[PDB]
Amino acid sequence: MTNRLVLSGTVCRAPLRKVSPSGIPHCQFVLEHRSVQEAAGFHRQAWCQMPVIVSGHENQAITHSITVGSRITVQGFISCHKLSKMVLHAEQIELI
Amino acid sequence: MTNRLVLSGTVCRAPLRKVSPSGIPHCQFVLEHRSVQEAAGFHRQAWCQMPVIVSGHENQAITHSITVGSRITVQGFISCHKKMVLHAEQIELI
């Protein structure tokens, strides 16, 4: 049922843009997250490079503010395909 | 920096209790998620198999009750190696 990743980071690859044959715009970039997280009472570095996909006409405009160096937070669902790779499908983007 | 994953699924690999060299036990299993999500006005299938690490003694009665086929909702932060793991903070048997 529940599937929600909220993740902040710095964009490490600029949006690569395409439109589907049926007219659906898709925007793809990579978000690099790095932070200090808490577990069992000791601090530890969390690092990951998350591919993000922005699909549909709704969220495309803000995507043109996103460049390598942009700090953003992305809220959405994760999806894996296969040798498996994970993508964050953006539902909300906040420009920090 | 926000790092928060909330994921429901089913246990697809038997949980194993390991011990960190620092005296801290943890429980590892793999969590299989399969849901219908909405994108560009269409229903997308979302699937994932997430490795999950649960540390700290407070989650042991729930952890010890977990088997292959258990339906759980997991909440924590993600981290990446070489691989992606979810470091579980909250764990509920749904």
Swiss-Prot record, chain B:
Q: Which residues form the SSB domain?
A: 2-94
| Result of knocking out the encoding gene | Called priB302; no growth phenotype, 2-fold decrease in recombination proficiency. Inviable at 10 ng/ml ciprofloxacin. Resumption of DNA synthesis after arrest of DNA replication (upon UV treatment) is slower than wild-type, no change in survival after UV treatment. A double priB-priC deletion causes a drastic reduction in cell growth and/or viability. Strongly reduced UV resistance and greatly increased SOS induction; when associated with 'R-230', 'Y-479' or to a lesser extent 'P-557' in priA. Synthetically lethal in combination with a polA, priC, rep or lexA deletion.
Transmembrane segments annotated in the record for this chain: none
Which Pfam families does the UniProt record give? SSB_1
Gene Ontology biological process terms in this record: DNA replication initiation; DNA replication, synthesis of primer; plasmid maintenance; replication fork processing; response to radiation
Give the UniProt keywords, A-Z: Disulfide bond, DNA replication, DNA-binding, Primosome, RNA-binding
Q: How is it modified after translation?
A: An intersubunit disulfide bond is seen in some crystals.
Its induction, per UniProt?
Induced by hydroxyurea.
What, per the annotation, is the impact of changing residue 45 to A? Answer: Increased binding to DnaT, loads DnaB replicative helicase
A molecular function (GO) held by this record is:
single-stranded DNA binding
GO terms under cellular component = DnaB-DnaC-DnaT-PriA-PriB complex; pre-primosome complex; primosome complex
Disulfide bond residue pairs: 48-80
Domain annotation text? Answer: Displays high structural similarity to the ssDNA-binding domains of single-stranded binding protein (SSB). Unlike SSB binds ssDNA in a shallow groove on its surface where DNA contacts both monomers. The L45 loop (residues 82-89) plays a significant role in ssDNA binding. PriB's binding sites for PriA, DnaT and ssDNA overlap on the surface of PriB.
Q: Which family does it belong to?
A: Belongs to the PriB family.
Q: What does this protein do?
A: Involved in the restart of stalled replication forks, which reloads the replicative helicase (DnaB) on sites other than the origin of replication; the PriA-PriB pathway is the major replication restart pathway. There are several restart pathways, the PriA-PriB pathway is subdivided into 2 distinct pathways. priB and priC have redundant roles in the cell. During primosome assembly it facilitates complex formation between PriA and DnaT on DNA; stabilizes PriA on DNA, presumably by preventing or inhibiting PriA DNA translocation activity.
UniProt-listed NCBIfam families = PriB_gamma
Q: How does it assemble?
A: Homodimer. Primosome assembly occurs via a 'hand-off' mechanism. PriA binds to replication forks, subsequently PriB then DnaT bind; DnaT then displaces ssDNA to generate the helicase loading substrate, which allows DnaC to load helicase DnaB onto the fork. ssDNA is displaced from the PriB-ssDNA complex by DnaT. In a PriA-PriB-replication fork structure, movement of the PriA CRR domain exposes a surface to which PriB binds and contacts ssDNA emerging from the PriA pore. Binds PriA; binding is improved in the presence of ssDNA.
| This protein's name | Replication restart protein PriB
Q: Which gene encodes it?
A: priB
